[PDB]
Design a protein around this ligand. Structure first.
Ligand SMILES: CCn1c(=O)c2cc(NC(=O)C[C@H](C)CC(=O)Nc3ccc(C#N)c(Cl)c3)ccc2n(CC)c1=O
Length: 228
């Protein structure tokens, strides 16, 4: 693969993501000024754990569907053996959704677009694990510091997904092929955009893994055997 190819790989991932990103950044960034009232907050706080978990599971599902589309639009992905496509999406998509969150995170007021307005971590009081919720908030908060561009997310999350060190892949060598190809595409973009300085300050390897582990460690207790 020469560089002019690696160029197209960037261009592709970036297109693919631009279609599959759920909400336009403009929509999110405009909507920061729109925030839940204390009363509205209290309304969400007064819910059942069962109901907040029911909701959030729906939203997560809706999200995971977009990530499945993102993956489908990666050429190379579609070319991988059927089993492997699944193994990857199963370990990955969660972690991707987590990285995608930062776009909905507003550092200024430590809030996030949920069901139409922005709200802080205390909206999710009902799930009863402020600890996890706010480390999730922290994760997003530190990514917001990076001012992660849209193409950088596209490329990062692709790299979250394609990871030949997932247990269960049959065609490991094929996955590697893709994986390195995307690492080099990623390095290339950070040059073209003089953004090499962000690598050094990317989220610690599997601080992300640990955070999603913990989240499914809490989904499995309510939404047992649900498709995800
Ligand atoms: C998966 C980690 N994560 C979030 O990404 C996350 C995101 C947002 N908001 C957005 O991403 C903007 C979206 C266009 C609309 C949307 O609400 N999506 C959404 C997606 C995944 C999940 C989950 N679970 C949820 Cl509750 C919602 C809100 C809360 C999130 N949480 C709980 C603190 C959260 O835990």
């Amino acid at each position: 693969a020469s560089l002019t190819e690696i160029e197209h790989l960037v261009q592709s991932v970036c297109k693919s993501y631009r279609e599959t990103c759920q909400l336009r950044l403009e929509d999110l960034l405009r909507q920061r000024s729109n925030i839940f009232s204390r009363e509205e907050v209290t309304g969400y706080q007064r819910k059942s754990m069962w109901e907040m978990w029911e909701r959030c599971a729906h939203h997560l599902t809706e999200a995971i569907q977009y990530v499945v589309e993102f993956a489908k639009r990666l050429s190379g992905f579609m070319e991988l053996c059927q089993n492997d496509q699944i193994v990857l999406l199963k370990a990955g998509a969660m972690e991707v959704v987590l990285v995608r969150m930062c776009r909905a995170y507003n550092a200024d007021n430590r809030t996030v677009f949920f069901e139409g307005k922005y709200g802080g971590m205390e909206l999710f009081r009902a799930l009863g694990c402020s600890e996890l919720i706010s480390s999730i908030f922290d994760f997003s908060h530190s990514l917001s510091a990076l001012h992660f561009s849209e193409d950088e997310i596209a490329l990062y999350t692709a790299l979250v997904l394609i990871n030949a060190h997932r247990p269960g892949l049959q065609e490991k060598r094929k996955v590697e092929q893709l994986q390195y190809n995307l690492e080099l595409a990623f390095h290339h973009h950070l040059c073209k955009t003089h953004r090499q300085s962000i690598l050094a300050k990317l989220p610690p390897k599997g601080k992300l893994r640990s955070l999603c582990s913990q989240h499914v460690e809490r989904l499995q207790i309510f939404q047992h055997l649900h498709p995800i």
